[PDB]
Amino acid sequence: SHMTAVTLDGGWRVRLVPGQEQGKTYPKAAAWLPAQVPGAVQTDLIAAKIVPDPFYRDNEGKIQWAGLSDWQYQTRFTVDAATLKREHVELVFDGLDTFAEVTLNGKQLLSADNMFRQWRVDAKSLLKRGDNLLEVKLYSPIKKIQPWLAKQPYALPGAYDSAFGDEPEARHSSTYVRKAPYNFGWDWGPRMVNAGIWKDVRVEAWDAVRVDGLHIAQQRVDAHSAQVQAQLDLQAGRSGPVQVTLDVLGPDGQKVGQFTQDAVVDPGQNRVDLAVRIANPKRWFPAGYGAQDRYTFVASVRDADSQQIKRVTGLRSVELRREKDRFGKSMEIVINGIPIFAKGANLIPLDAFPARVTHERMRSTLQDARDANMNMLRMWGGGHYQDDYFYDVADELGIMIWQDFMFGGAVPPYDVEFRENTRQEAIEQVKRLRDHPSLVLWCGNNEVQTGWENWGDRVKFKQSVDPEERTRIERGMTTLFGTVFREVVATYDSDVPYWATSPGTDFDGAADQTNDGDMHYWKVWGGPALPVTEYLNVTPRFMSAYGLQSFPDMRTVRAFAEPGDMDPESPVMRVHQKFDKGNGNKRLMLYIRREFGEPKDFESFVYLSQLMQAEGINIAASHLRASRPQSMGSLYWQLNDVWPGASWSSVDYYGRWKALHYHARRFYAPEMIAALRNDKGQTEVSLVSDRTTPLTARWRMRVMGMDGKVLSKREEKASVNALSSQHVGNFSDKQLLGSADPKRTYAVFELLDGDTLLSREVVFFAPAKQLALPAAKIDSQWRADGDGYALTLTSDTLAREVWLSFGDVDATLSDNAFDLLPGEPLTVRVTSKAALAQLQSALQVRDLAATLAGAPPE
Amino acid sequence: SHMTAVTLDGGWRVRLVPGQEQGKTYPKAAAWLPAQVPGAVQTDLIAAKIVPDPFYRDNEGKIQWAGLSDWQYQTRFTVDAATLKREHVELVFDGLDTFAEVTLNGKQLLSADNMFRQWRVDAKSLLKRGDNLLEVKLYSPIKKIQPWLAKQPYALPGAYDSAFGDEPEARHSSTYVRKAPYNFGWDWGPRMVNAGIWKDVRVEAWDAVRVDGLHIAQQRVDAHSAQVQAQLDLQAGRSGPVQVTLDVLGPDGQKVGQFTQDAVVDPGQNRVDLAVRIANPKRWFPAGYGAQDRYTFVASVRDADGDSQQIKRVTGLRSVELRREKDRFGKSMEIVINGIPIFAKGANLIPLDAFPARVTHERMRSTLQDARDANMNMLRMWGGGHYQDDYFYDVADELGIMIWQDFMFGGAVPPYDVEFRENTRQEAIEQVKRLRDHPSLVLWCGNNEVQTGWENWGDRVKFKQSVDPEERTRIERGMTTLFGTVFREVVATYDSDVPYWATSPGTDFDGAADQTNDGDMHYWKVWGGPALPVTEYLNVTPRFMSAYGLQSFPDMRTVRAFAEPGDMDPESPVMRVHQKFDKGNGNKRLMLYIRREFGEPKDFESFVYLSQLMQAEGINIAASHLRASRPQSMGSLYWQLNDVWPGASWSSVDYYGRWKALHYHARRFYAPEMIAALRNDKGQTEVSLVSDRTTPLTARWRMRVMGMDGKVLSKREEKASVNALSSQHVGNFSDKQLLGSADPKRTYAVFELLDGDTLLSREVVFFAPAKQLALPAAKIDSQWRADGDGYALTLTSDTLAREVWLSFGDVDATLSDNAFDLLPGEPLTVRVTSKAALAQLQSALQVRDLAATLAG
Ligand SMILES: OC[C@H]1O[C@@H](O)[C@@H](O)[C@@H](O)[C@@H]1O
Ligand SMILES: OC[C@H]1O[C@@H](O)[C@@H](O)[C@@H](O)[C@@H]1O
Structure with a gap:
């Protein structure tokens, strides 16, 4: 049969x-x-x-x-x-x-x-x-x-x-x-x-006939129509007639059309194409920009006795726009004619042992991205191409995939055999993945060009070989990443863009520039280890990597460690820190100490580490969104983990959210207020809107003594064009504070629609370790909420970075790592199978001030 | 409408x-x-x-x-x-x-x-x-x-x-x-x-609709079937229906298929693709390998107003493979058409005029017919020229002359700015779309000599080592992108059933350019550089030879066309102006080669003739050697076929379309069945029977050693069975075996390949440079006879006459043969084609031969 x-x-x-x-x-x-x-x-x-x-x-x-x-x-x-x-x-x-x-x-x-x-x-x-x-x-x-x-x-x-x-x-x-x-x-x-x-x-x-694949090639997609071509690959062992029927189903489930094509196949490879035109398509949009609508293409093949193959696919246009403007040459992902500021992170494998990854974990990783208001993940080239199912979930949830081919940054050899082995890999992976709407860009590698140009060991290498050998090696790279991958994408997935190397300018010129292409920025955390405020001085056209480290959740630490190990420089902790050949907890301590001084204990260490990371990335990510159109992308390093340990992740190996991942939902919010104070004592205020319509809205600023008294209050109307960032103020410390003590004073900035609160940023004028933070009394009040609960928090004073936990009880939160403002209640939803009474007793409440109080010197 | x-x-x-x-x-x-x-x-x-x-x-x-x-x-x-x-x-x-x-x-x-x-x-x-x-x-x-x-x-x-x-x-x-x-x-x-x-x-x-193009995309082609896709590019101003009908006509103009497709177009660009499968196709073959069968595809597009527009493509159904396989000689390079590995026989084609706009169709056709008549199956259109006129490609399709198509980059290092790159990309797209349906265009090539120049020419080496190494990397990257990515991608996107080649000579950027064991080669150590003796051609055997050559002067009528009697000296200011090799001092290099073989030319007319003989015989060595070496080599493209103006060049046909000796020799050394008898500098003569047939050749070959005085020294004859598509070595003879203490200055050997009584091919071998020989003084009898439209001219020499050259002053006439050897007593009849009257022809006829030219 x-x-x-x-x-x-x-x-x-x-x-x-x-x-x-x-x-x-x-x-x-x-x-x-x-x-x-x-x-x-x-x-x-x-x-x-x-x-x-x-x-x-x-x-x-x-x-x-x-x-x-x-x-x-x-x-x-x-x-x-x-x-x-x-x-x-x-x-x-x-x-x-x-x-x-x-x-x-x-x-x-x-x-x-x-x-x-x-x-x-x-x-x-x-x-x-x-x-x-x-x-x-x-x-x-x-x-x-x-x-x-x-x-x-x-x-x-x-x-x-x-x-x-x-x-x-x-x-x-x-x-x-x-x-x-x-x-x-x-x-x-x-x-x-x-x-x-x-x-x-x-x-x-x-x-007689083997069906080797189906591909729905999108030839042109706009609001008026989608013109596609259903392409069927057929292996025949002998020459004979075939009859193909194609059914097309809408996102609603309705019946869009039925199409047929007769053909005679001949021994070997055969292509049978059926053109389909959909009027007024229900296109696929990234998260935050509409529905993730998809059509289903079901083809049957009767040979000389039928056979079935199904493809679920999303209609959308993809353009990598690089236009000359006042900041040089832009780099922006354009989906269905909408320029999308890329909001997300870098995705690495889900486990050190990839074969044992469950569907549940793949799905959870993507839902985490979704919930943190991300619209793109970059699948870094040092990993592996993901499971089909992972891409299915990204299609469903509307998370765009920037897909590296799996070169992680080493310099490849230039022999023909290696090249041709790699080509066949490329062809197979592009054929496998191409019909996923979420796969919107292909990228030849991670960091090969920028490493060759900027890393000491590459620079020393390339200058030590004979210049003729250098040319051979460079010709190898150029061909592999500029020609071979590019051609595979052009042949098999022709409607999506290709990019030679991240970061780069697609081999137009040098890698890692600020006025063309994308950038990985590591002068913060890595290298000179600059203060996180340095993030405000870097503004490339697209930032595809940057980040800060932190420890995983407490539960996760107890999972790979035992009490004797509970010290940042214990042998076990060292093993679980892989940066700077085993001595990267020093780098972490460097950054923690700068902002918070010395942690009281190992519990506060983990917490402060997560705060240092969360607050640092908030600076960069907000700065980049606020800079639009100078910048058009923010992908931090990194989303996830392969194993239990310290890393740059926002979600740890066991799916546990760090403070960064909760901050991420805020700084990636569709409507966001950025208020960012630089090292010059200048606080720039911007309103950011990813809406496709005008935002009519108000914003306010309040300057507060930590003793609870208000110093000044301002409010203004705001009209923000679609898809823009609008600078609405630039305030020196003098203007905000007057003669008030910077160590005892803070500012609150909020964005409202009517008077629903859309976004808030709290600003300080000194490193937290120098502040006179008030001792907060935080009031807990629970309430049933269907299967889950509502937890309401009320603080008498400012409480910074409130962290809710429940020991080893299982419960997840709609929010965490948040500021409470004097007399202002905040309700989170608690999801847990545990009863009200057990969540009562389990609940632990931590805040910055209480954590810093009683701390040793450095 | x-x-x-x-x-x-x-x-x-x-x-x-x-x-x-x-x-x-x-x-x-x-x-x-x-x-x-x-x-x-x-x-x-x-x-x-x-x-x-x-x-x-x-x-x-x-x-x-x-x-x-x-x-x-x-x-x-x-x-x-x-x-x-x-x-x-x-x-x-x-x-x-x-x-x-x-x-x-x-x-x-x-x-x-x-x-x-x-x-x-x-x-x-x-x-x-x-x-x-x-x-x-x-x-x-x-x-x-x-x-x-x-x-x-x-x-x-x-x-x-x-x-x-x-x-x-x-x-x-x-x-x-x-x-x-x-x-x-x-x-x-x-x-x-x-x-x-x-x-x-x-x-x-x-x-409503503009039909922007028709392309017949050949998906797979073999004896059993051709699966193709008729691709219609439609520009529409507004959304609406179209009905496309397609007629397919076979080589005889009779309809072999009919097809219909409806579609709705939308503003902008639209593709309407019709699948066509032709059972038992009559495939297009290069000259010498069957018929140049072509199918005509006629599309009609009925738009939404109900109005119809017609577009047509004449094309040829054929598979093309660039086969590169590891073997005992390294990695092969051979073009394979409809499953037949074709030894490429031909030359490099340049523009037909310094002013390309005034070139007539007649001159385009004549250029390709010359190639056809000289038994060529391929021209390379060299990247220093221009993309040719539509009509030229039609004629090549018609006559079976394959085109190796360079993009128009001639050797300069190009700049790496994006604007230049994108300007060029659009040129590439437009040219590939215009030319893709000519069956004759079987290969696209990024440039002429850019890589080998970068690697091997002193000025590039000096230049690339003088700039900062970071700048060297930027320039090399720009090259590798332009020639390795951009052009390759255009060909892959718009003409994907034909191979692409980054640079000639090269290995397609796999490694270095101009290897002998991988890819193709341009060889210029003869004529150029150290200027080696032409027998050095016997020592050079790359997998594919896509350029090499020797210079000569044009026909005497062409010389008279651009110079006056006062100017008739190789070093006159006017002859130097018309010599463009080595800053006008190329007549020095020309005299080097002439003198080596023939000594000092007697007068200017002898200089022109000896220049042509030098070139003809030299190329003979190389071309014969390359074919006899099959499968070590699988291509011979000599530099060059034609001229852009009257002057000294490497051409075998001059600017006025007049054949040089080389062109008549080319017809012999490119003949489908050929005997190679090649004597190296160590006095060893290797004899090969070369057969481009796709069937066994059952034949005989023979040899006769002769004294200049007419005596016969020895004979031998032998049956031979030659495999399809092959070269068979059938003897290697020392001078001692051939000469047996007869004076090498007074002796020659004739080699002949026969099929039945039909002489297919003849080579006459000598044992010393012509200037050392005792050539006999020839008496050449000429006799004329009417032959309908034209005249049959029979020549009979009493002794050996080498390289007999026939001319008629400024009287126009073409010949079926010229620059031939007459053997003592053996008459040769040539056909003379001419508007002129027999009386004038007999009066104007001049007969030159080598001995008489050398006689002083
Ligand atoms: O160093 C943290 C990470 O930074 C990224 O930009 C890449 O270089 C990764 O390979 C690396 O693991
Ligand atoms: O030197 C004669 C010819 O040789 C060819 O290989 C190319 O280099 C041409 O540009 C040149 O005109």
Whole structure:
């Protein structure tokens, strides 16, 4: 009949290839173990209790040997009556990580060398009735490449040194292998050089025609119409007639149209195209700009006996607008003719072990983005291309994906074999992902050009080789990221833009400029470690990375640590800090101390760390939105985590929100007031509106003594054009304070519609550690709210950065890390299965002033 | 209703833009003078007798001012009431050379800055009933670019210095303007920095829909079927229905398919694609590999008003593969057409005139027929020229001459600014869309010699090592983007069934340019550089040879056309002006090669003939060697086919279309079945039977060793079976075996390939340079016979006569053969084609041979 597929994900065992030193050291791993597919031998070893959980305390080093070893997977499967007589029977590996040799009933069947490629092999003649034996050998990429690398004239500038000394300094095998770069350890992740059959394996069988894919190519989309072309790829083993029927369903569920096309297919590849025009399309818009409407395209193929394939897709135009203006050349994402200031963050993998990521976690990550008012995530090139399901959720929720190809910043080799291996990966990933409306941009890599131009080790490298070799290496990069990826996108996903490298100017000129293209800014946190107010002096056309570190939630810390470890410079805490080769808690202390002095205890440390991060990023993100149209994007580093540890994330490994993620919802709000005080004692006030209509609204400013008294009060009408930022005042300290003590005085700025409160920013005139913050009495009052509750908070005085917690009880909050103002109640919604009485007793309430009180000197 | 178009080519006049010093110097140019459109102001001046013909003697210099000046074209044209009532009225310029500013009824209309671009402009609101005043101002690219260039930190390497000192040394404006590189002077052509409206101008008007193009996109083609997509590009002003009908006609003009598609168009651009599958297609094949079968696709577009417009494409169904596979010689490079690996046999094609606008269809056709007649299957259209006229490509489709199409970059390092890059991208798009449906265009190529120059030419090396390394990286990046990304992407987007090639010679940016074991090669160590003996050709065997050559002078009639008796000396000022290699001192290099083989020419006419013999025989060695080496090499494109003006060059056919000896030899060394008998410098003669047939060749070959005095020394004959598409070595003979102590100065060997009694191919081998031989004194008998339209001329020599050359003074006549060897006693009949009377022909007939030329 039609094609069939059977998944070979069960019955798998695994062990060390016989003869390795690791087999003597780990004899249990020399014998067969149950193996997960999809999975990793690493997680297989963990499940079998041969090694302890590498995420817990200091166990990271105990599993490093597995990445240095060669592995042998085995399974047995049966092929039945019907299957063996089909005209085609193929084995299909969706993911082999990475250097793989596949054997079927003892005969060599496939060599593989790309974690991101799908491998399809003709199996029919080698199969048999009943028991078949499938074997997959996986070779350590470190062990494989290093002996070859040791013999080379030079090693290309790579990624991170091994903390375990199993690779030479500045001689990294990772740049020579198409494998997720973060597997080799990063500056927020452990070194887990995974080996695995990390995606599904199938037996597939078919007769006359195989349906190789469906793509809805959008040719032009506007409000009047969408002209699309449904493109069907068909493999035929012989020449014959086919009949294709295409059904098109609206977002409402209605029936838009039915379309048919007859064709004769010929042996090999065949393309059958059906044009569809939709009048007055219900287009797909990013979050905050309308509905995430989508159409469904269902095609059937009758050959000489039918077959079904379905594509859900969203109609929209995408333009990367780069227009000359007074700040140079712009960079802005334009969806359905709407210029969208990009609001979001950088997305890294969801786990050190990618095969074990649940749908729930993928969905949760995106819903977190959504709830924090983000409209774009950048999928950073040091990770892996995501699961289909992840992209489904981004389509549904309206989170735009800026999709890096998976180059993380190492300098690639220029040999043809590497290039062509990478091309086929690119083609496969672009074909896989192209029909997701959320995928609006493709980007060749993370930071390769800017590293080559600005990082000391690249600069030293490129000047130490002969200039003729430098040209070869640069020609390699230019071709890979300027031609190969660009052409794959142009061929297979032609309606979306391509970008050579982030950050860059698409190879027009140099990387990382402030008046053209995008920028990653790291002079704050990294490098000279400048004060966070320096963020106010940087304004590129698009900021695609910047950030600050903080510790995860308390619950998360207890999850990888035990009381003996509860110190910023404990061995276990050090292991969980990956920045600045293990001594990055000093950098964190630097920033914490500047604003808050010395934390009283480890609890306050975690909190202050999250405040330092949250308040720092608020400065930058607000500054950038306020600068429109000078800037048109803010993607902070980073959204998420791979493991329990310190990082730049706003949401930790267990989905727990940091203070940053709650602040993010505010500074990314559709209507926002920015009031940002610079180091010159100048406070600039702007009203920002992402609305497509005019905003008629008022704003007010109030100057307050911390003793509770009002000093001055101003209010004005405001008319803000659509999609703009309007500067509405610029106030020196003298103007705001008069002779009032800066250490005892603050300012409140609010934006209102009618008198519904849209946004608020509270301004201070000194580092918090120098303030005379009042001691707040905060009043709790609960109330049923259906399945959840309403918690109302009232403070007699200013309370800064109020943090609500419930110990180990499970409850999430509509808001947290907020300011309370004198006599002004704030109600949050508490979601929890726990009863009112238990949330009563569990509730802990922390604030800045109470936290700073009783603190030691520095 | 349906779109209408009026060509605005009549009634132009032209003059210097007022206010220039040249207006004082050339008062007649300051006044209005008739202008020809298409044309050049240069040729308008010549027609007006304001300057003498720059092709004649040393008149080149007298017209240089015109390239340094700004020009004002003007014409009046009428627009009727109906046109003004169409929904759309546009002016279209197919070609402005180059920096142009267009004005209509005194209002600025269009700025243009690319010779190779088409410019369409909305004109309707500016037009008026009755008379309209159209003006085009053209600005000298030199005068415009040089003051800017002078303020730059460096100038990019590229092109030729001005022999007239009107641009500083190694600071060339041409690099920065999109204009035919050879206009600024080249090493076989004069400096004619043309300004002109050099292609047609039209007023076009349309209502509901404008049909912007038809393209037949070949998806897959084999013997069993061709799956194609007829792609219609429709411009609409308003939303509404269209019905498209498509007729498909086979090579015999009979309908092989009929198709219908309805669609609704919307404002702007629309694509209507019709899938067509042709069962058992009659595919297009290159010359020598079958018929040049073509299908005609006729589309009719009924718009929403119910009006119909027709558009047509004649095309050829064929698969093209650039096959590059690892083998014992490295990595191959061969073009494969309809599954047949074709050894490429041909030459490099340059423009047909220094003034491309006056080239006739007749000259285009004749150029391609010459190639056909010399057994060529491929011309490379070299990037220093211009994209050719539509008609030229039609004729190539017709005759089966494949075109290797360079984009028009000739070797200069280009600047890396975005504006230049995007200007060029639009030129690429427009050219690829215009040319894509010619089956003859089988490959697109980024440029001529940019990479190999950058890597191997002293001035580029010096230049790139002199700038800051960060600047070197910026320039290299600009190149790699332009030639590696932009052009590749245009071809992939708009002509995706043909291969793209970043640069000739090269490896497509995989690695370095000009390798012997990967990609193609331009080889110039013979003629150029160290100037090696021509037998060194036997030592050079790249995977594909896409340029190489030797110079010669043009036909004596062509020489007489541009020089007078007083000028007939190779070092006369006039002959030097017409020698453009090495700053006019190329006759030194020419004499080097001539003297090496033949000694000192007797007189000037002997100099011309020996120059042609030197070139013919030298190229013979190389071309024969490359074919005999198959599959090590899989292409021979010699530099060059043709000329842009009368002068010394590497061409085999001169500016007036007169065949040189090389062209007659080319027909022999490119013959489908060929015997190669090649003696190297160590006295070893390798004999190969070369067969381009797609079937086994069952044949015999033979050899006869002869004394100059007529005696027969030895003979041997042998049956041979030659595989399809192959070269078979069938002997290697030392001088000792061939000569057996006979004097090498007094002995020759004849090699022959036969099929049955039919002689297919003959090679005559010698054992010493001609100037060392004891060539016998030949007595050549000639006898004429009427042959219907023309005449049969039978020549019979009593001794060997080498390289017999037939001519008729200034009497016109063409020959079926020339520059041939006569063997003692063996008559050769040549067909003589001529309007002239037999009486005049017999009277004018001159017979030259090598021994008599060398006899002093
Ligand atoms: O250093 C924090 C992060 O900053 C980003 O810009 C990239 O360089 C990442 O690879 C890195 O992990
Ligand atoms: O030197 C003769 C010719 O050689 C070719 O390879 C190119 O370099 C041409 O530009 C040149 O005119």
